Structure formats: structure tokens, C-alpha cells
Design a protein around this ligand. Structure first.
Ligand SMILES: Nc1ncnc2c1ncn2[C@@H]1O[C@H](COP(=O)(O)OP(=O)(O)OP(=O)(O)O)[C@@H](O)[C@H]1O
Ligand SMILES: Nc1ncnc2c1ncn2[C@@H]1O[C@H](COP(=O)(O)OP(=O)(O)OP(=O)(O)O)[C@@H](O)[C@H]1O
Ligand SMILES: [Mg+2]
Ligand SMILES: [Mg+2]
Lengths: 464, 393, 50, 334, 464, 36, 50
């Protein structure tokens, strides 16, 4: 029979059940908050068995007004979310309740948000390149179709702008289905993305799930699983090619840390939950593609305090095929898309996959930029003047390369007004080969800002 | 053909036994996040394998006066309160045998590659004592990595431990997988004194990365003699803490039988994190960097079992290539330095060198192999005697 | 390399066909075997023959 | 060569699938046959008898200080109550329960009396000036013996006094010759609590007043005309001092304590159906032979086992259930 | 009378005894593990009295297989180890069980592993130099005969190679007894040392006690004390000169830290036990020599995190007469043995002991190297030509001095292939006097690299 | 109320010799010695 | 949705308010800015950053 609340510790609630009717882990429980100003049907997710028939649960809605001793009824199944083509074109919350029209999706097929990752036997390595149209991405961090991609960065570096840019580049012409998971990000950005997709007519092909900042840690960590459940349904049952954008997946681990602190679990290195790796993997292992059915995932990742050694980014690095680190230094120079060319990497940037010419040009560019970084120690104090002539030429073409990796993105229009530009892979390879060989050392550095292309480079040079 | 299919099941059915034994039970009184406390089981041994109802195995680490704190090695989602817990009567152990070659197995030895069951010869406990000082002989047989830098500057010999340590995407897995692939020519000889068997332990690696490694091994013909002990990210901290020990046990079975083994641990850093998680969930007070006080005893207990056995013990060997991921090129961190002090040599792959063109990116100055010339053929010992110091200078 | 890959793919396809037919035949035989196998398994489970 | 190995692996995989299909069909059909055969009562009793024949061939939570103190208090209680009549034992029990309740409520007095000391004279003086004029002489003597000695924790004093209180009713039953009746009827209470988990969880006087808990008990369980009076008094006394322990577990432990005071050990037995009297006596004899003590057998007969008996005594279990056999057969398939 | 295991937590076991039979602190208890694969007799050492007749003990062998309630018997005495001339030429573990010949010492005199250090009355400072044949050690950090010597170094900077070299240089030309204590080090190094000593016919004068890192924390705590007990028997009961090599003494404190939290002690500084100084002092002050009977102790020390400010090395520095501080910087530069000339010190480097000629050259070398260290900042950025002429010439001298402090060590033939060398102290003094005065400034730098003396320097210069 | 008075009398009731109840690592806990 | 970074270095030099351009930015702005103000201030941010 029904249980009874015995402790409330913020968004964590302890509930005592009869001696033999204790719910299973991740089961959904329902409690009632009857205070008029904020009465609601509080939803709890069982997280631990404390003994003595007590279970400690994570609240999805904020436990305000909840009273000790209120009846708690277990649904007998984990939190479930709607699935099917019906979800496409609508905005859902962490629990599957539609937002643009609340009655939607009740009669749709429901899937539990907790599921084992696909068996190892069904995993294959994805290596097909996804030509985004960004010079930096298409040259140094070639994204993988069907693989996991990350956009690392701190505050105000361009993660969300890149996410929307790759929505324009990939989703706008994608032949399958898309899912967007707002995990602990702004509701303003969620609404902006909603209107943008409605205007671009991409909304009908995408399912939006939002667990935005104002929500307690419970939904702020289960929203990713809900969006992943919709994406998994599209991947498996419908056989569609799926895109899965997740902004921002660090908030999943942050909510996990908060819940861990509330659950009494001892803190880890820098206060994170001890199960950071486990809780991160149980999600990321599900975002994998399998043999005959692909899921291209792109995940913004927050790097708190711009500390790339923080346990959350350090853990999430191991679950990525392509990684694009965004740095404060590149952002201050005005070199949007803000990518650190040296920290970023891709698993398909191998000569056997991207080709000999692409790999050679990428390696030469990386060499020039690494030499420039190594010379920073002298550049800061004495300037360019005191370097050796070979190093002087290297640094000049390194500045030009660093600035040419900048591009005018479509998502940047709203900021700059200048329309975005697309540069195909062949042109990028040719342009950077010429840059490394020194064929453009006579042009001013100002010509390479946000230019996107050889022809448009010549245009701006003539303008200057 | 159909005769064998019928006969296998027929033999199983005939061998089925109705024997019953005085099994002893406890009851779960607390569960969650991979840890379960079991009241009862008065005769449970420390580090014993407990059997939970869903075929889920755990290991009894804490033995208090009240409850037995056990780490669930598997899916803890189904471990409810009040469930029966039976004691296996067997200390933490995994199956071992030649059947494990060319397979991908969980830290418990049960296969996950989707192929059949593994016909284990026996079961080896994960915590047998490492060979003593009198049971070893000097590392003298070279293990050819196939990489000029390693074989010339920091040679890896059969029985010694070479820590491949570096930042992300520096070439650690590339070096280890190339080492495994380079043993195919030795394997094809058919000579146990030259064959090098391999056990690639994957810890906290996304399943597709383990699939990539397996594909690379297959295309190189290496799965014929390589085992993969996969503890992918998804599995709870228990498997990620147990996987190096399972791989070391599988290798040790061959080692004590006079065969040469090569163990790769990608990454011992992810083992330390998993052990930290288990200890903090068991509520052990942590030490420095929030790690358990005895993380050093974890990595040492693991690596020190890689040894070159004396002729009285069959003359086998187990070569360990532990992999460590240093954050931000800091070789002075805690776990990196622990593993460096535990191992016989280090290959420090630096991102700066990797970008400069030095592939693989061995920082010659930091890297060293304490076996040195003893792990090289006379030719390379002569033409490359001082190569590492010359390059450092 | 390409010739060997093509030959291997053709051999795999031919196996997937002929071996599938062989498996169908063996399954037909196992269908008759099931009755006796289950009877003996139940006899062992209960004990006292039957 | 790699392609040859791959086709050989494909053949092995197909062999595996054929074997798995054959084994799955065989085990499913075997389970059907087992369920059909064991369903007949004659076959069920035959399996029970075969299992019995097969078997025929086959203060713990108190630390040192508390353990010795409870042993000494039990020795004093045995010396004293030996000369007391049923009314005297009842008075002893009620006064011990009342002082236990007072100690439970008056935590400061409990800590003062239980805090170990070299000299017990201050403790005896504190006990006398507070209880000597409120309880009988024998109860005061038992309390003096309990308090004078040293306990590991404060709660252990309540545990010891409550244990003596329980032993009071136990010896009252023993002199009355009601031992068997109280044992069986306490087992009946245990069954009733097990069948009503909400009721058992609700008798926690830790969460409510003990008077209300005992009132609920009387209205629900011991108010039935057919209950033995001694058992009702025992369980009411236990619940009024329950201190957060589950009522069902408390009653099971109380029945185990009663049988231990008799000397026997109780083994909980589950069977597909109630066994015959010959089956009962054979089970008792074989269990006593195995465990070297007179074993009291309680049958929890349930059809889920679908066959032979299952036994649970202490931490040990014998598992002859046909359901366990089916599970083993299904899981052991290659 | 016998105890009873109540609680097992890793290497720590709690044993409950009857009231009148609680074992004393540091007593040795015996339990039995009967599991077939791990069957053994487990030796526990009482570390705390918890009350209510409970004692808490460290396990000298792994507790795997140990069962609650298993009988525990009291030996009535602390862990005892064999002593006598018999121990020489054999290999023992921390408990005194011989390894190369099991049951060898069971009939010898057994001494308690725990004993107080000699009284302050018996102590006398040692001021005799121990010439070893290494340029750096003999010049900058002269070793003290009868004193305490240490080899500090981060992870993997050559502590084992250097301690083996100094075994070769001291013990092989030394008529007294020698004792080696492999405290928590690599077993391969210990086996190589055993084989080397057997081949060199020095084993008969050497007693080896190994508690290598495969052993649980208790064995690493007590192997040092066992070897040291053998050492003090050779000191006090035979009046014979003794060498006590310990590799590595930090492992004693580290093992103490591993069981520190399980014993109920709150952590201190960076995770270390509160009793770090007390325990390490109790162990170290036993190593001291007393007047008329000398122990020349040579103990490597590990520097965790390569940080010399770590509490363990910092507290160990106070127990040493000579300190050779190895560093990873020198090792990376290629200057093996990797001794840090500046951070290293010796209390016998006094003009009243080593002679004014030795002291002046040592101090000039230290001054030159310190000035070079200061100038390395300018050189890397501004350049070498921007220095003063005197400072430029000093930089040349300093580079040559750093490379001359390197030496081809006998135990490092595997590192370099070439055989070792022994440089007499007077030759070292003359060579470094000349270097500081510039008589070898005209030779190339490589002429001084890994060269053992002036004759070899001339040969290498003529070769280059 | 009278319970509090009895407790007050008991507490005000207090050579003095104690007993070591816990020892280890240089620290010993001594039961007794009310006037220390 | 955007930060106005007031630098102390500019504040001490008399530049009050010390809005550090480039680092300072408004994201949800631009859409909400009267047309005349936008027309006159379009080039101002670039000019000051340069
Ligand atoms: N390509 C670009 N061109 C011009 N301005 C840009 C560009 N990319 C980013 N910006 C500026 O930087 C701001 C960064 O916005 P964005 O939402 O991407 O930040 P973020 O740091 O990735 O996100 P968050 O605050 O959620 O961590 C943009 O609002 C805009 O002000
Ligand atoms: N010697 C080499 N020459 C060229 N490319 C190399 C070499 N070694 C590695 N790479 C490439 O560099 C990247 C390093 O990948 P790898 O998995 O080997 O690194 P890692 O240090 O093990 O990384 P991680 O911690 O992510 O697993 C891959 O692109 C690999 O293809
Ligand atoms: Mg954002
Ligand atoms: Mg790797």
C-alpha cells in the first residue's frame, strides 16, 4: 500500500513504506502538496534503500509546502516519457508533460527513462566524416556522423552559439529526426531556440525537451535521460537517423553533485559526487550509435572556472569522438568560433579516414600553432622583433592561420549582422595548405578575421 | 551435425544434479549506488563473492559486527532491501584458461562479446600473493614494441612494467595497441617461449572505443592471442575497480604455466577513480585528493604481480603496460607519481611534442626504462646504448 | 587487398546461405529432440524417473 | 585466413543458436511437465518424502561488558524468581516494564544509571531514592543488580531490564505449564503481523504514545477471544517498550526467545502443502539430527515452491523447492 | 583466553578478548584463514585498545578469507625476528620467515621488533667522511661514516639505481656486516640486488629483509623495524660496523597513513596520519649510531607528488647527516645520477673536517651553480649574448660543472652500456678546482658528460 | 520534577583512581577521576 | 544574458563608467534597441575595440 513521508531534506525526501511494499530503485512515487499557493502532485524518484523499509527519493518538482506524514503512492514503474513521431514538433519537460499544450502525449506510447546501454556486441566504431562547413571544425576537429561530439568551454565562449550554428548546418538539412535537451540552461535560450526552429520550419522534425535552470536538481539531471529516451526510440523503433543536441551536459553532473550532497554521500575530489564517472557513463553510454542505426550527438560542456581539469570535463572527455575546446584566450582575440586548435581533437583525423592531404595540412597547421604557443613566453615580453627569422615567418603565418580559423557563422548574424558563410572541405584544405606554404604572408592579418573562404579572403584583402 | 547439437544439451540434462547443500543466507538491509549492506552471513569471508537474487554478484569488503558491506559487481538497479544474499563460499575469483583468447569479458570473466560461454580451465582468486624476491629472475628477454622510440630509448622487457603516461590524445592507446599487434609474428612461430599473449584491460572507456580497439586488433590479426577485459563506462564502479585484477589473474594463469603475457591497463587512473567511488560509498574516510588511503596498495598490489618468474616456476612472465592520463601535463600529481614509483620505467607522451611532429610523443628526458640494455638485443644495445641521454642532452 | 576483401565477402555470403539451410535442417531435427530432452530434464528435476 | 576464421565463427554462432533453442524448448517443456506432475497431491507428498530422505543422509548483539552484565542479571533473576508465584512474577514483570518505560522517557536518569563507574554506591542510592518507594522488593533487587554492574551503552540498560521483564512472563508460563501454548500462539501473532505489514509498521511506539499502540493491539490482535492470556501480555509488554524495532520482527524474536528458554531452536519451513504427521515427525527428527538440538518446525506452506520443502534455521537454509530446481535448470543451460 | 575476530576492514581487524586477557599494545596475535586458495596463519599486531576488551590490530598478511568470529590467539610478545650471524647471507620477510630457505631461522635467537632508541647519553656525533668514489657525493655532500644518509627523489629519478651503486661502492669494500631493508619497493629491484650480491660474493656478509610493495600496509610498516632490529643486534651484541640500507623509508610512513583512517585517527596535513613525526622519529632514532659502535645508515626517501615540501620528506630531513636530493629536472636534463647540487647538503661539509681545500671548491661550485640557476631565467628569454662577460664565462663553467657532476656509475651500466668509474676524492677536488678556475673552459661541454675523472675527461675531449 | 532532584543529588554526590578504557597512539582515555 | 565588465584600470584613469569593451557584451540586446540608436552605435563598438 501507499507510503508515508518521514524526512524532507531539500529536494530529497525519505519515505517509509510497509514492511513488504518497498518500491524498486528509480520507481516513480507521487506525493501531494496541498498548500494553496503552490499545491502540486510532487513526483519523486527512488534513489536509495536506507533500510527499515525507508527509501530516499529525489524530487522532480521543488519540495516546498510538503508536510511530513503525507501519503506517497508508488506508480510501480520508473519515470516514463512519451515516444513516437508525435513528440516531434513539441516542447516537453523532464517528466514528459508537454508544455505548448499540456494535454498532449498522454495516449502516446510511454518509455521508461532508465534503460541499459546497448550491448557491447551491437556497438561499432563510427568513422564517416560530417562536413559541417566550419573551417576549424572541418580541418582540425572533423566531426563524426553517428559519433559523439562535444563543445567544451567556460562562461561566454560560444557553446550555445555553436550549438545553434550546427543546428543550422546539420539539422536544417538533416533527413531524419532531431532532439534537443535543455539541461540546466537558460529558459530564455530554450524559447529562442523554439522560435528559431519554428521560423526555420525545422521544428516539425525535432523534439524539444527542457529541464532548464530554475528546476530542482532532480529534473535537472533526469531531463537528459528523458531526451535520450526519445532519441533512443527514434533510433531503435523507427530506424530514423537521429541528431541529439544537449545544452548543457555539465549541468547533469552539477545536479548529480547537489543530489549526492543531499543524499549523504561523501564528497569526491572537489565536492562532486563519488559516482561522477558512473552517473556520467550510464548516460553517455546510451548516446552511442549501434550497427545499423545512427545517433549523432552534440553536447555543450561547461568548464567551471575555466578549469579544464575539473572532474566533470575530465570525465566527459573519455566519452567523445570529436572534441572542440573553446578557450577564453581565443575568444578575447575576437576569433569566433573561439576554438583552441591545440586542445581540440577528433578520432577520425587519421590519414586512413580524412585522406593524406587533409591530415598533412592539419598536422602542419597544428605544428605552426604549437610553435606559436611555445614562443608566447618570449612574445609576451620582447615581442615578435627578437625571434629568429624562421620563427618570425612562422609566427606571422601562425597569426594568419589563427585568424583564418575564425569564421562568420550564421548564428553570429544576430550579433554581427554580417551573414554567415559556408566553406567546403576541399576549399578549406587548399586554403590552409596555401597558408602554411606561405602564399598569403603578404596580406594583412586584418584580412583573415571572420572571412570564411579564399574568394572572400581576396575580396576583403582588396577592400583593405 | 545435428548429433552434436542434440548431444550437448542431452549431456547437460543428464549431468543436471538435484544436490542440495546447507547454504547460508543474509538479507539486504541497505542498498544504492552499487553498495549493499547485508545483515547476517556470519561465516562470510573478507572479499568473498556474494550472490544476489538476479544472478548479480557482489564482493564483501567490510565485515562489521552488524552488517556486511558489499560492492555490487554488476547491475545494482534490481538490488532491493530484504532480498536474500547467498555466500558463494569462494573468495573473489575469476575464471581463467586458454578459452579467454580472442574474447571480450567482464571483470567477472563472463563474456560480453555476444559469443558463447568461455570454457574456463579453472578459477583463480584475484588476490594471490605476487612472486616473492626468490621466485623471480632478471628481466632479460626483449618485448619488441615495434616503435623505434620505445625500443631504442626505453626498451620494454618481458616481465617488467612500463607505465605509458600522458595527457589526453597523446598516443598511449596507440602505443599499447601497436605493441599488441607487433606480437603476431612471435605468435605465429607456435613456440611458447616466443608467443606473447595479451590482455587489454579497458576501464571507463566508452563501448565504441573498446570496439575500435577490438577492430584494430582483428584487422592486425591480434585477437587470435589477445583478450579484452572490458569495464566500459556504463558499468558501476565495482567493475571498473575489479577489471585490472581480472586481467592480471587471467594473465597470471598463463604466466605460472610458463607462458609470456602482456597486460595493458587503459586507464589505471579510471581504476583509482572507481576505487575512490567505492570507498566513499562505503564511507571510508578519504586521504589526499579525496582518494582512499590505500590507492597505492591498489596499484601496487596489481602491478607487482607482473614479474619474470624463475626457472623453478616455469620461467613465465607478465609484462605490464599501465596507462595513466595526467591532467594538464602534470607528471607531478599524486596517482601519476604513485604509478611511476611502482613501475620499472615510464614513457611520458607530451601533447606539445605530439603537436610538434614527434610521434609518438616520448619526452625523452622524463622517460626511462630501468631494465634498459637488459631488455634489448645486443645489436640495439650497441647502436643505441646512450641514445636516450644523448637526446635529453 | 580489394580482391581478397571481395572474395572474403563472397565466401561470407555463400556461408550465410548454405549454413543457414544447414541450420534449418538441424532445427527440424531439434524439434523432434525437444520432447525427449524435456522429458529427461523433468525426470532429473523431480527424481524417481518420470 | 581471416575470412576463413570468420566463417568458422559464424558456424559456431549458428551452433550456439541451435543449442540455445533446443535447450530453451527442453527446459520450458520440462517445467511444464514438472508443474503438471507436482500438482497432484500424491506426487507432492512423494517429493516431500524423497527430500526428507535425502536430508536424512546429510546477547549476540551485546559487547563484552553488556554481555557479562546481562548474563549476571539473568543469573540473579533465575535465583530470585525461582521462589516466586505466578502473581509475584506478574508483579515483577509489570514493575520492570514500568521502570523501563520511565528510563526510556527520562533519558537523563537512564544515562546517569548506565554511565559506568568504579563504585556503584551512588548508582544504588539514585535507584533507591527514586524507585524504592514505588516498586516491590524483588523488582528493586533486580534493578539494583542491573544498575550496579557496567554496560557498554545506555540503551543496554533498557535492553537488560526489558529482557528480565520478558523472562518474568516466560517463567510465569513455564510454572503454569503453558509453554507450548504460548510458543504456538506467539507464532500465530507473528503470522498475523507478517500478513498485515501496515499494522506491524504502525505498532511503532517510537512514533506515537505506547498507550495508543497497546490500545490498537488490544482492539486488533489480542482482543480476539481465542488468544492465550500469557501470549497477549507478552506481546503487549514488548510493543509498549518497542523502541522503534518492527513489531513483526520483535514478535518473531520473542517467540525465538521463548523456545530458546525451553531450549529448542525453531526452523521456518515452507512447503507446497501441509505435510502429513509422519512427514512432520520425520522432518523434526532429521532436523534435530542435523543441528544436534530439538528443532521446532513451523510450516509456512505456500504453493509457489511447487514441490519439495525449503527450510530456514538461523542463517542456514536448505533449498529443496522445485521452483529452485527449475531456476537452476533454466540458468544452467549452456 | 583466546580472542574472537569481531570486525574486519581491509588490513585492520578488531578482536574481542575476555576481560582478563586483553593483549598488550604491539603484541602479535595469530588468526587462521582456512579457505583453500588463501589458507594461512595471519599475524595481527595490536595497535589500539578500543575498550570493552576490544583491541584493533593491523594485519601483517592480507585479510582476504578471514571470517568473523574466527579464533585469535595471543602470542604474548611483540613480533619477533631472528638475530645472529646466521641471518647474514639470507633473505627474510618482515615476520622473520626466511624466503630462500624456509624455516631457516626458527631456532635462532629472536628479538622483539619494538624497542626504545639508545639513550641520549650513548649518542656521539659522527664526523668521519665516507669516501664513495662519486664526484657529486664526495664533493658537495660528503657522506658520514657512522652517520645517517638519505637519497631524496621524486617518483622514478634513480633512487634504486643510486642506492645499488652505493651498496656496490661501500659494502663491496667493507669488512663488517651489512643489512638491506626493502621497505615497500619494487620486487624486481630487490631480486636484482639479491642476484648481484650473490654473484659479487657479498651476500654472505649481507642480510636482506624484504617487505616489498605487494605486501599489505602492516608488512610495510614493520619490515623496516625488522631489518633495523637485525641491525641493532649487529651493533650492540657484536660491536661490529654495520651498514643499514633502507629502500624506501617513506613507505613506512605511507603504510602508516593507509591504515591511519581505519584505526580511527583523523587525517593531518595532506592525508597523512597525525602521528607522522612521532612514528618516524621512533623508527629513525633507533638507526643512530652510539659511541664505539657505528651503523652507517643509508635510506632512500620518496618525495610524493615530486614536492619536497610534503610533510613526510620535510619531517625526514631532520633525521639525516647527509642528504642527496635527486630531482626530475636534472634527470630530464640527462645529468644522471640526477643529484640536485644546490638543494643537497651534508653536515660534515665543514672546513674543520673535510679541509679548507675541499670546502672552498665545494662552495665555489655551489655558488657557480646557483648563479647559473638564477641566470637560466634571463637566458631562456633574453638570450646568452645579453649577459655580462663574467656572467657568460660563469655560465660556461656552470654547464661544464653540472655535466662533470654526472658520472658513469657501476650500477648504471644498463642505462649507458659503458662501465662505471671510481673518482678519488682528491682527484675530484682538483678537477672541480680547475673547472671553477677555468683550466677546462676551452673543452666542449660533452667532454664532461658521464665521464669519471680527469684522465677520462682528456680521453673524451680528444675523442670529440 | 523529583527525577531531576534525584539526578541532581546523584551528580552532587561526586584517593581518586580511574581506569584506562581506551589507549592508542599516545592517547589514553581514563574513566573516573571526577576531580581531575 | 550579457555582462558589463567595469574595469578598475579604466576607472582609475578617469574613464567613468569603466565599461571594458570587447569583454563586455549583450546577447539578448540588439533586438531591443531603438532604430536610431542602433544605426548610430553599430560602428561604435568596433571603433572602440580597435
Ligand atoms: N560568432 C560570434 N560572433 C559574434 N559574437 C559572438 C559569436 N559567438 C558568440 N558571440 C558572443 O558571445 C556570446 C556567447 O553566447 P553563448 O550563449 O554561445 O555563450 P556560452 O558561454 O557558450 O554559454 P553559457 O552562458 O550557457 O555557458 C554571444 O551571446 C555573443 O555575445
Ligand atoms: N605515432 C602516431 N602517429 C600518428 N598519429 C598517431 C600516433 N599515435 C597516435 N596517433 C593518433 O593520435 C590520436 C591519439 O589517439 P590514442 O587513442 O592513441 O591516444 P590516447 O592518449 O590513448 O587517448 P585517450 O586518453 O583519449 O584514449 C589518435 O588520432 C591516433 O590516431
Ligand atoms: Mg549556453
Ligand atoms: Mg586511450
Amino acid at each position: 500500500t501507499a507510503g508515508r513521508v518521514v524526512r524532507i531534506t531539500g529536494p530529497v525526501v525519505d519515505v517509509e513504506f510497509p514492511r513488504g511494499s518497498v518500491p524498486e530503485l528509480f520507481n516513480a512515487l507521487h506525493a501531494e502538496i496541498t498548500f494553496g499557493a503552490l499545491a502540486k502532485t510532487l513526483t519523486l524518484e527512488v534513489a536509495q534503500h536506507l533500510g527499515d523499509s525507508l527509501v530516499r527519493c529525489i524530487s522532480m518538482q521543488p519540495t516546498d509546502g510538503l508536510v511530513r506524514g503525507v501519503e506517497v503512492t508508488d506508480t510501480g514503474a520508473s519515470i516514463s516519457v512519451p515516444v513516437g513521431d508525435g513528440v516531434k514538433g513539441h516542447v516537453f519537460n523532464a517528466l514528459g508533460d508537454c508544455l505548448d499544450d499540456p494535454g498532449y502525449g498522454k495516449d502516446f506510447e510511454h518509455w521508461s527513462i532508465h534503460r541499459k546501454p546497448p550491448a557491447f556486441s551491437d556497438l561499432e566504431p563510427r568513422t564517416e566524416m560530417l562536413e559541417t562547413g566550419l573551417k576549424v571544425v572541418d580541418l582540425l576537429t572533423p566531426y563524426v556522423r553517428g559519433g559523439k561530439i562535444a563543445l567544451f568551454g567556460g562562461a561566454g565562449v560560444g557553446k550555445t552559439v555553436l550549438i545553434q550554428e550546427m543546428i543550422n548546418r546539420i539539422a536544417r538539412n538533416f533527413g531524419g529526426t532531431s532532439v534537443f535537451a535543455g539541461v540546466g540552461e537558460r529558459t530564455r535560450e530554450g524559447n529562442d531556440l523554439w522560435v528559431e526552429l519554428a521560423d526555420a520550419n525545422v521544428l516539425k522534425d525535432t523534439a524539444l525537451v527542457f529541464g532548464q535552470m530554475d528546476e530542482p536538481p532532480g529534473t535537472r539531471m533526469r531531463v537528459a535521460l528523458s531526451a535520450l529516451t526519445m532519441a533512443e526510440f527514434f533510433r531503435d523503433e523507427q530506424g530514423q537517423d537521429v541528431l541529439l543536441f544537449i545544452d548543457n551536459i555539465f549541468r547533469f553532473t552539477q545536479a548529480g553533485s547537489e543530489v549526492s550532497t543531499l543524499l549523504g554521500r561523501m564528497p569526491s575530489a572537489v565536492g562532486y559526487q563519488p559516482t561522477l564517472a558512473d552517473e556520467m557513463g550510464e548516460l553517455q553510454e546510451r548516446i552511442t550509435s549501434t550497427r545499423g542505426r545512427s545517433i549523432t550527438s552534440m553536447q555543450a560542456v561547461y568548464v567551471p572556472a575555466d578549469d579544464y581539469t575539473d572532474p566533470a570535463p575530465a570525465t566527459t572527455f573519455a566519452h567523445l569522438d570529436a572534441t572542440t575546446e573553446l578557450s577564453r584566450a581565443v575568444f578575447s582575440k575576437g576569433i569566433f568560433p573561439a576554438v583552441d586548435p591545440l586542445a581540440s581533437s577528433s578520432t577520425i583525423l587519421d590519414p586512413a579516414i580524412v585522406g593524406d592531404e587533409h591530415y598533412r595540412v592539419a598536422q602542419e597547421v597544428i605544428r605552426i600553432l604549437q610553435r606559436y604557443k611555445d614562443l608566447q613566453d618570449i612574445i609576451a615580453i620582447l615581442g615578435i622583433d627578437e625571434l629568429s627569422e624562421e620563427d618570425k615567418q612562422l609566427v606571422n603565418r601562425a597569426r594568419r592561420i589563427e585568424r583564418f580559423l575564425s569564421q562568420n557563422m550564421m548564428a553570429a548574424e544576430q550579433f554581427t549582422g554580417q551573414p554567415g558563410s559556408t566553406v567546403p572541405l576541399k576549399e578549406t584544405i587548399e586554403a590552409f595548405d596555401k597558408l602554411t606554404k606561405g602564399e598569403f604572408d603578404h596580406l594583412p592579418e586584418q584580412a583573415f578575421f571572420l572571412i570564411g573562404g579564399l574568394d572572400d579572403l581576396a575580396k576583403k584583402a582588396e577592400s583593405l | 551435425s545435428a548429433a552434436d547439437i542434440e548431444g550437448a544439451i542431452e549431456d547437460y540434462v543428464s549431468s543436471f544434479s538435484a544436490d542440495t547443500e546447507r547454504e547460508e543466507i543474509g538479507t539486504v538491509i541497505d542498498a544504492g549506488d552499487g553498495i549493499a549492506h547485508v545483515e547476517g552471513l556470519p561465516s562470510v569471508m573478507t572479499q568473498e563473492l556474494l550472490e544476489f537474487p538476479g544472478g548479480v554478484l557482489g564482493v564483501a569488503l567490510n565485515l562489521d559486527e552488524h552488517s556486511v558491506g558489499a560492492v555490487i559487481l554488476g547491475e545494482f538497479e534490481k538490488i532491493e532491501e530484504g532480498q536474500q544474499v547467498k555466500r558463494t563460499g569462494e573468495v573473489l575469483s575469476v575464471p581463467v584458461g586458454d578459452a579467454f583468447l580472442g574474447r571480450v569479458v567482464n571483470p567477472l570473466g563472463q563474456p560480453i562479446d555476444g559469443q558463447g560461454d568461455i570454457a574456463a580451465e579453472t578459477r583463480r582468486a584475484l588476490e594471490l600473493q605476487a612472486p616473492s624476491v626468490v621466485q623471480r629472475q632478471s628481466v632479460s628477454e626483449p618485448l619488441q614494441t615495434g616503435i623505434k622510440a620505445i625500443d631504442a630509448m626505453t626498451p620494454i622487457g618481458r616481465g617488467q612494467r612500463q607505465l605509458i603516461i600522458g595527457d589526453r590524445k597523446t598516443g598511449k592507446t596507440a602505443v599499447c595497441v601497436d605493441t599488441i599487434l607487433n606480437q603476431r609474428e612471435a605468435w605465429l612461430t607456435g613456440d611458447p617461449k616466443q608467443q606473447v599473449r595479451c590482455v587489454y584491460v579497458a576501464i571507463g572507456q566508452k563501448g565504441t572505443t573498446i570496439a575500435s580497439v577490438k577492430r584494430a586488433l582483428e584487422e592486425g590479426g591480434a585477437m587470435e592471442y589477445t583478450t579484452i577485459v572490458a569495464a566500459p563506462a556504463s558499468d558501476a564502479a565495482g567493475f571498473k575497480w575489479l577489471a585490472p585484477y581480472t586481467g592480471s589473474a587471467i594473465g597470471q594463469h598463463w604466466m605460472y604455466n610458463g607462458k609470456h603475457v602482456l597486460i595493458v591497463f587503459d586507464d589505471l587512473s579510471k581504476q583509482a577513480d572507481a576505487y575512490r567511488a567505492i570507498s566513499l560509498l562505503l564511507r571510508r574516510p578519504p586521504g589526499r585528493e579525496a582518494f582512499p588511503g590505500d590507492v597505492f596498495y591498489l596499484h601496487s598490489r596489481l602491478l607487482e604481480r607482473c614479474a619474470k618468474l624463475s626457472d623453478e616456476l616455469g620461467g613465465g612472465s607478465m609484462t605490464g603496460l599501465p596507462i595513466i592520463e595526467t591532467k594538464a601535463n602534470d607528471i607531478s600529481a599524486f596517482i601519476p607519481t604513485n604509478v611511476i614509483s611502482i613501475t620499472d620505467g615510464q614513457c611520458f607522451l607530451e601533447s606539445d611534442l605530439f603537436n610538434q611532429g614527434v610521434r609518438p610523443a616520448i619526452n625523452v628526458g622524463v622517460s626511462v626504462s630501468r631494465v634498459g640494455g637488459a631488455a634489448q638485443i645486443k645489436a640495439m644495445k650497441e647502436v643505441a646504448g646512450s641514445l636516450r641521454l644523448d637526446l635529453s642532452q | 587487398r580489394a580482391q581478397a576483401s571481395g572474395e572474403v565477402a563472397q565466401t561470407l555470403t555463400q556461408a550465410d546461405q548454405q549454413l543457414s539451410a544447414q541450420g534449418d535442417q538441424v532445427r527440424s531435427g531439434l524439434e523432434s529432440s525437444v520432447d525427449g530432452l524435456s522429458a529427461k530434464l523433468a525426470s532429473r528435476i523431480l527424481g524417481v524417473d518420470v | 585466413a581471416q575470412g576463413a576464421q570468420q566463417i568458422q565463427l559464424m558456424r559456431q554462432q549458428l551452433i550456439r543458436q541451435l543449442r540455445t533453442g533446443l535447450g530453451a524448448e527442453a527446459v520450458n517443456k520440462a517445467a511444464e511437465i514438472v508443474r503438471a506432475h507436482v500438482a497432484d497431491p500424491q506426487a507432492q507428498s512423494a517429493t516431500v518424502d524423497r527430500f526428507l530422505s535425502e536430508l536424512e543422509q546429510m546477547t549476540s548483539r551485546l559487547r563484552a561488558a553488556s554481555r557479562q552484565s546481562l548474563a549476571a542479571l539473568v543469573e540473579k533473576f533465575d535465583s530470585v524468581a525461582g521462589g516466586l508465584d505466578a502473581d509475584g512474577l506478574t508483579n515483577l514483570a509489570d514493575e520492570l516494564a514500568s521502570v523501563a518505560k520511565l528510563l526510556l522517557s527520562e533519558t537523563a536518569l537512564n544515562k546517569h544509571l548506565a554511565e559506568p563507574t568504579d563504585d556503584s554506591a551512588p548508582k544504588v542510592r539514585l535507584l533507591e531514592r527514586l524507585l524504592s518507594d514505588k516498586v516491590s522488593a524483588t523488582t528493586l533487587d533486580l534493578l539494583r543488580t542491573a544498575v550496579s554492574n557496567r554496560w557498554s551503552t545506555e540503551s543496554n540498560l533498557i535492553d537488560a531490564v526489558e529482557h528480565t521483564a520478558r523472562l518474568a512472563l516466560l517463567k510465569r508460563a513455564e510454572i503454569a505449564g503453558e509453554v507450548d501454548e504460548v510458543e504456538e500462539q506467539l507464532f500465530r501473532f507473528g503470522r498475523v503481523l507478517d500478513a498485515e505489514p501496515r499494522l506491524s509498521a504502525l505498532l511503532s511506539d517510537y512514533t506515537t504514545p505506547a498507550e495508543g499502540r497497546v490500545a490498537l493491539l488490544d482492539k486488533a490482535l489480542t482482543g480476539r477471544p481465542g488468544v492465550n492470556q500469557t501470549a497477549a501480555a507478552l506481546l503487549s509488554q514488548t510493543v509498549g517498550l518497542l523502541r522503534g524495532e518492527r513489531a513483526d520482527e520483535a514478535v518473531i524474536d520473542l517467540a525465538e526467545l521463548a523456545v530458546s528458554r525451553r531450549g529448542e531452536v525453531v526452523a521456518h519451513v515452507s512447503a507446497a502443502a501441509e505435510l502429513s504427521d509422519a512427514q512432520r515427525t520425520r522432518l523434526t527428527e532429521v532436523l534435530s539430527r542435523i543441528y544436534g538440538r530439538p528443532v521446532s518446525v513451523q510450516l509456512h506452506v505456500d504453493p509457489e515452491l511447487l514441490g519439495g520443502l525449503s527450510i530456514t534455521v538461523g542463517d542456514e537454509v536448505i533449498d529443496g523447492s522445485i521452483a529452485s530446481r527449475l531456476a537452476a535448470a533454466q540458468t544452467g543451460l549452456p
